[PDB]
Motif scaffolding. Sequence first.
Motif, PDB file in Angstrom:
ATOM      1  N   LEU B  88      -3.991   6.899  20.933  1.00 28.17           N
ATOM      2  CA  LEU B  88      -5.072   7.856  21.152  1.00 28.17           C
ATOM      3  C   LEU B  88      -5.706   7.513  22.495  1.00 28.17           C
ATOM      4  N   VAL B  89      -6.909   8.019  22.758  1.00 27.57           N
ATOM      5  CA  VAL B  89      -7.655   7.660  23.962  1.00 27.57           C
ATOM      6  C   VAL B  89      -9.061   7.201  23.562  1.00 27.57           C
ATOM      7  N   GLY B  90      -9.256   5.887  23.524  1.00 26.48           N
ATOM      8  CA  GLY B  90     -10.567   5.331  23.260  1.00 26.48           C
ATOM      9  C   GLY B  90     -10.800   5.118  21.779  1.00 26.48           C
ATOM     10  N   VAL B  91     -10.830   3.864  21.336  1.00 28.41           N
ATOM     11  CA  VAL B  91     -11.068   3.550  19.933  1.00 28.41           C
ATOM     12  C   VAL B  91     -12.062   2.394  19.835  1.00 28.41           C
ATOM     13  N   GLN B  92     -13.271   2.695  19.376  1.00 26.51           N
ATOM     14  CA  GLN B  92     -14.282   1.682  19.094  1.00 26.51           C
ATOM     15  C   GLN B  92     -14.361   1.489  17.582  1.00 26.51           C
ATOM     16  N   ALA B  93     -13.383   0.768  17.040  1.00 26.78           N
ATOM     17  CA  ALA B  93     -13.423   0.393  15.633  1.00 26.78           C
ATOM     18  C   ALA B  93     -14.541  -0.612  15.395  1.00 26.78           C
ATOM     19  N   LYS B  94     -15.297  -0.400  14.321  1.00 19.58           N
ATOM     20  CA  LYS B  94     -16.461  -1.237  14.065  1.00 19.58           C
ATOM     21  C   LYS B  94     -16.519  -1.769  12.635  1.00 19.58           C
ATOM     22  N   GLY B  95     -15.988  -1.026  11.670  1.00 20.57           N
ATOM     23  CA  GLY B  95     -16.126  -1.376  10.262  1.00 20.57           C
ATOM     24  C   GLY B  95     -15.341  -0.454   9.373  1.00 20.57           C
ATOM     25  N   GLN B  96     -15.956  -0.044   8.262  1.00 18.22           N
ATOM     26  CA  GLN B  96     -15.329   0.874   7.323  1.00 18.22           C
ATOM     27  C   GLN B  96     -15.309   2.298   7.861  1.00 18.22           C
ATOM     28  N   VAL B  97     -16.115   2.583   8.876  1.00 17.09           N
ATOM     29  CA  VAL B  97     -16.044   3.838   9.601  1.00 17.09           C
ATOM     30  C   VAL B  97     -15.319   3.598  10.918  1.00 17.09           C
ATOM     31  N   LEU B  98     -14.694   4.656  11.414  1.00 17.42           N
ATOM     32  CA  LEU B  98     -14.005   4.648  12.692  1.00 17.42           C
ATOM     33  C   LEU B  98     -14.788   5.504  13.674  1.00 17.42           C
ATOM     34  N   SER B  99     -14.787   5.082  14.935  1.00 17.19           N
ATOM     35  CA  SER B  99     -15.520   5.772  15.988  1.00 17.19           C
ATOM     36  C   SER B  99     -14.557   6.087  17.118  1.00 17.19           C
ATOM     37  N   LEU B 100     -14.455   7.363  17.471  1.00 16.37           N
ATOM     38  CA  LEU B 100     -13.566   7.779  18.546  1.00 16.37           C
ATOM     39  C   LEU B 100     -14.147   8.997  19.245  1.00 16.37           C
ATOM     40  N   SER B 101     -14.113   8.968  20.573  1.00 17.70           N
ATOM     41  CA  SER B 101     -14.639  10.033  21.417  1.00 17.70           C
ATOM     42  C   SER B 101     -13.445  10.712  22.082  1.00 17.70           C
ATOM     43  N   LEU B 102     -12.857  11.677  21.373  1.00 21.26           N
ATOM     44  CA  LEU B 102     -11.681  12.397  21.868  1.00 21.26           C
ATOM     45  C   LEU B 102     -12.106  13.608  22.700  1.00 21.26           C
ATOM     46  N   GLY B 103     -12.595  13.309  23.903  1.00 20.08           N
ATOM     47  CA  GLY B 103     -12.762  14.297  24.947  1.00 20.08           C
ATOM     48  C   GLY B 103     -13.835  15.337  24.728  1.00 20.08           C
ATOM     49  N   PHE B 104     -14.682  15.185  23.719  1.00 17.31           N
ATOM     50  CA  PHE B 104     -15.785  16.107  23.523  1.00 17.31           C
ATOM     51  C   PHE B 104     -17.078  15.433  23.955  1.00 17.31           C
ATOM     52  N   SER B 105     -18.173  16.177  23.835  1.00 15.04           N
ATOM     53  CA  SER B 105     -19.483  15.596  24.081  1.00 15.04           C
ATOM     54  C   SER B 105     -19.917  14.701  22.933  1.00 15.04           C
ATOM     55  N   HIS B 106     -19.383  14.929  21.737  1.00 15.36           N
ATOM     56  CA  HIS B 106     -19.717  14.047  20.642  1.00 15.36           C
ATOM     57  C   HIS B 106     -18.540  13.140  20.312  1.00 15.36           C
ATOM     58  N   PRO B 107     -18.793  11.858  20.072  1.00 11.82           N
ATOM     59  CA  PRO B 107     -17.787  11.001  19.432  1.00 11.82           C
ATOM     60  C   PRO B 107     -17.787  11.221  17.928  1.00 11.82           C
ATOM     61  N   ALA B 118      -8.276   0.297   8.907  1.00 14.73           N
ATOM     62  CA  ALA B 118      -7.826   0.529  10.275  1.00 14.73           C
ATOM     63  C   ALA B 118      -8.274  -0.613  11.168  1.00 14.73           C
ATOM     64  N   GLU B 119      -7.451  -0.954  12.154  1.00 15.92           N
ATOM     65  CA  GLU B 119      -7.752  -2.089  13.016  1.00 15.92           C
ATOM     66  C   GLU B 119      -7.701  -1.672  14.480  1.00 15.92           C
ATOM     67  N   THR B 120      -8.087  -2.601  15.351  1.00 22.91           N
ATOM     68  CA  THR B 120      -8.169  -2.356  16.789  1.00 22.91           C
ATOM     69  C   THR B 120      -7.386  -3.411  17.572  1.00 22.91           C
ATOM     70  N   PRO B 121      -6.048  -3.370  17.504  1.00 20.80           N
ATOM     71  CA  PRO B 121      -5.250  -4.394  18.189  1.00 20.80           C
ATOM     72  C   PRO B 121      -5.164  -4.218  19.696  1.00 20.80           C
ATOM     73  N   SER B 122      -5.530  -3.057  20.226  1.00 21.22           N
ATOM     74  CA  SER B 122      -5.389  -2.799  21.649  1.00 21.22           C
ATOM     75  C   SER B 122      -6.525  -1.884  22.080  1.00 21.22           C
ATOM     76  N   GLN B 123      -6.387  -1.294  23.265  1.00 18.99           N
ATOM     77  CA  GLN B 123      -7.425  -0.461  23.849  1.00 18.99           C
ATOM     78  C   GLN B 123      -7.291   1.006  23.465  1.00 18.99           C
ATOM     79  N   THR B 124      -6.063   1.482  23.265  1.00 17.23           N
ATOM     80  CA  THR B 124      -5.773   2.897  23.090  1.00 17.23           C
ATOM     81  C   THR B 124      -5.070   3.194  21.770  1.00 17.23           C
ATOM     82  N   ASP B 125      -5.121   2.272  20.809  1.00 13.54           N
ATOM     83  CA  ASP B 125      -4.205   2.265  19.680  1.00 13.54           C
ATOM     84  C   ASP B 125      -4.949   1.976  18.385  1.00 13.54           C
TER      85      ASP B 125
END
Lengths: 38, 169, 207, 141
Positions: B88-107, B118-125
Motif C-alpha cells: 500500500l502507500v503509508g501504514v501507521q499500524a498502532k494497535g487493534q485498529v489500523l491507520s492508513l491515509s490512502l490519498g484522501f484528506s482523511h486517513p 495486522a503488523e508493520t514489518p516495513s514502510q509500505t506493507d
Amino acid sequence: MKVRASVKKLCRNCKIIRRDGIVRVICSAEPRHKQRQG
Amino acid sequence: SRVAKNPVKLPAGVEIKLAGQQLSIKGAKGALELKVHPSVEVIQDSGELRFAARNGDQQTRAMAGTTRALVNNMVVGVSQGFERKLQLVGVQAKGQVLSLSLGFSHPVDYELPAGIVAETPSQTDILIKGIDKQLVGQVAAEIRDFRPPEPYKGKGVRYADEVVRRKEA
Amino acid sequence: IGVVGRKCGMTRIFTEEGVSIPVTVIEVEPNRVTQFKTEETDGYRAVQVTAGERRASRVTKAQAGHFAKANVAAGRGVWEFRLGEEQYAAGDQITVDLFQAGQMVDVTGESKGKGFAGTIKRWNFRGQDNTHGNSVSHRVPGSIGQCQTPGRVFKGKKMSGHLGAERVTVQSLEIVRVDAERNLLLVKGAVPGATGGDVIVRPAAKA
Amino acid sequence: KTYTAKPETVQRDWFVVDAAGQTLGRLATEIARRLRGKHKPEYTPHVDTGDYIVVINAEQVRVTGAKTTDKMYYHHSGFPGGIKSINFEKLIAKAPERVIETAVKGMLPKNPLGRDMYRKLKVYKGASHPHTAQQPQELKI
RNA sequence: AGGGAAACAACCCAGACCGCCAGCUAAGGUCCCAAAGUUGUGGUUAAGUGGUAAACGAUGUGGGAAGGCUUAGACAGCUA
RNA sequence: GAUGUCGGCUCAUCACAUCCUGGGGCUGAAGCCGGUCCCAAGGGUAUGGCUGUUCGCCAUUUAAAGUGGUACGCGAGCUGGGUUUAGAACGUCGUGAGACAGUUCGGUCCCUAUCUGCCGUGGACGUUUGAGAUUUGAGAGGGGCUGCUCCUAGUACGAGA
RNA sequence: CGCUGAAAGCAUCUAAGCGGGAAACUUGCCUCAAGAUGAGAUCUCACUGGGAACUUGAUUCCCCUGAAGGGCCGUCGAAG
C-alpha cells in the motif's frame, strides 16, 4: 461488462461461468472481454 | 482425481472433537474452529481424517469436496498462521485498529475483529496473521476496496502478486 | 418529554450587535404529572401532564377522580408525552427548566382555521385569465382528471375545502430565552396558531 | 327431505395446528376444509358447520423452492401509484401470522359465510395460544 | 337451450315434450374456492418452466448411439 | 333517433426506452472533460421574439430544459386564434350557376349534478352496562430537488498547459 | 466489487456458507388513523328498589326511581 445476447470466449483466457442464473464471461487477461449475459 | 477421497492428513497437534454431525477443531496457534458439517457428509476417523458422500447426487458431490477443503484449510490454519502481504502507500499500524491515509484528506481508520492481527514489518506493507483463511481473505478484501489499483501511474493497495493491468495514454 | 404552554403572541429581541431576532413567546404555566404510563401496565412508556385552572363545575366526577388520584388539583386539557427512559412520580412538576438556550426545539399547535379555502388558497393553484375572452370561471379549478381512461377521479385529488385547524408541527426552532422566574420560553420565529392557543414544545426530532 | 344443518344446534370443536415446518398451502387447505366443515357429514353449504382452528407457530411455516425470497404479496392502497408489495420473508418478519391468514382466506369463499368461517381461524406467533379454556386438541400430529 | 373452455353467437361435448330430493355417462375434470384421486407404478423437470416468444448464445441436466486418448502409467496442477 | 376538431390555459396521472441528480463496468478513461453500456422512476425537469400553431427557427437561461400512454388526457373546466355555415374580395378554373394542392377581411361555444368518482364536513347506529378523558398503531397520506463560492490544495495527477 | 469454495487434484462471487453496495424499497421525519365489525388498551366516575302475567338467554307489563353524564337553550370564539 458488455451485455449481449451471445457471449463467447473471445480469446483463450476467457472462461464462461453460469453465475446466479446468468451466463457471464470472465477474462483473466483483458477486462474488455468481460461480458454479461447471453 | 476428485478431492474428497483425498484424506486430510492432520498433524499430531490437531486434537479434534468428533460429535456425529458437526466437527470441532482445537489446537495450538489458534483453536475453537467449529463447523456445522452438513447432512450429506460422512466424518470418519483413523490416524488421519477423510471424507465421503452419502447419496447419488451432483449437489453432494460438490459438498464433500468443499467439506474436505474447509477442513483442510481449517486444520492447516489451526497449525499455521494464514498470511497475506498487502502492499500500500503509508501504514501507521498502532494497535487493534489500523491507520492508513490512502490519498484522501482523511486517513481512514480500519478496525480489526477478534481472530485477525495486522503488523508493520516495513514502510509500505502489511502482513496479516489469522487462523481461518476465510477471515484472512475477507479482511484483505476489506482493505483492498479502500483504494483499488489505478492502472496508469499506479496507486492504491495491491496484493502480493503482480498481475495488475497497466495502461499508457 | 416536552411541555405544554400557550402562545402569547410574537415580540422581538434586539441583540447587542444589532440583529433583531423574531421571537414568539410561549407562556408555560408549570405542567403537573397526572399519570406515569409504564409498559408493564399500559404497553408503552409515557407521562400525562396537566396545565392549570379549570373551574370546579366544568371538571366531571370521572375527571375529578382522575385528578385526585394524583393529588394535582388540575386544569385545562390533559396531554401525553412518549418517553424513552425517564421516571416521573404522579405528583411531579415539569417546568421550563428542561430547556436551555440555544436548544433546538419542535413546536406543535393547531393552525389558524381558514374556513373553506378554494384551490388557489388551499393548494396554490394558478388562476385562469381574467379578461381574454374568459367566461364565468376565473378562479375555479381546471380539469379534474382524464377522459375515459380512468373514467373516475383519482383519490387524493387536490380540491377545495377547509384549510383549517389541523395540527401542525414547526420543527428546529431555536430557543432564544428560557425565563424561569415568570415561566416563559422565547422561541425564534413563528409557531402555529393564534394567541392563547395550546401549544406543545418538545425537543427536536431532527438533531 | 334431506337434512339441513341449522346454526343453533351445530357442534363445533377447538383444534390446534402446529405449523412448525408445514408447507403453507398444504396446511391451509386442511384448515379451510375444516373451517367450511367439509369433514363432517352434516355439511350444509349455507351454514358454517366448521371447527375453530388455532395455529401456533406461524413463522415456522415453510414455502418450497425459491418462494421465500420470491412470492410477492400485493395490495393497492387506493391512491394512484399506490401498489405495494412485500415478499415472503419480510412479511414473516413483519407480521408472521398474516401469511397463514391470507393463504386460508383465499381458499375460503368470498361470502359473508367465508368471513364467518375466517372468524374461526385463530393463528398466533409463538408456541402458545390464549385459548386454554376452550381446550383444543392437537390434529395432524 | 344444456355442460366444458374463468368471463367468451360461430370452438369441444351434446340437440331441452313435461314432472322427480333416482341412476350411468360425454366433453372437461378430481388440493381449497367448487362436485370428484392430496390414487397407484416408473421417470423427467428447480424455472414458479408449467402459467406468452424468434434468430442465436450457454461445462443446466436426463437418455441413447459412436471414435481415440485409456497403468510401457492419460486431461490441469511441484523437483534441469 | 349526434362519441362536438387543432392549438393554448387550468389541472393532472402512469410507464421507463433516465434529461438532471444517485451507483457502477469497459475504454483508444493521465486530470477537467468525455464515448458507450448496465442499475435506479425518489424529487426535479426554462422565460421570451415570430407564427393559430403542435413542431420549428432564433434570443437568453438552467443541474436539466427527457421520451411516451392517458378519446393524438383534459370545451356538462375556460378559450375560440386555425379549420370553420351563411357576407365580400383577389389569383386560378368554368360559357355559366359556381368551384379551389388556394389566399384574404368578418363571423352566436347551452345545461341549476340524480348516480358513480373526488375534496370537505356532519347525522345515525354499532363496538356487549353506561360515561368523562388519555391513548397504542394495523393501515394510509405528505415529504423527498438543486446551484455557487470558499475551507486540505494550486495538493494527488500531468514535461508543461 | 468480493472472501472462502468445490462439482471439475486446478481455476472460479456460489453450488453449500459469509460480506460490502444507490436519491429506488422498509423504517427514520410530519399528519390522519380501532367502522383495524380483528371495532384494541389505560385511568377514573355512576347506578346496590318491589310486584304481576306467561313461555323461565327469560321476555313483557305496572309502581317507584331516573345517577354518571350528554343534549336542547343562552352569551360567544383568533372555530365555522
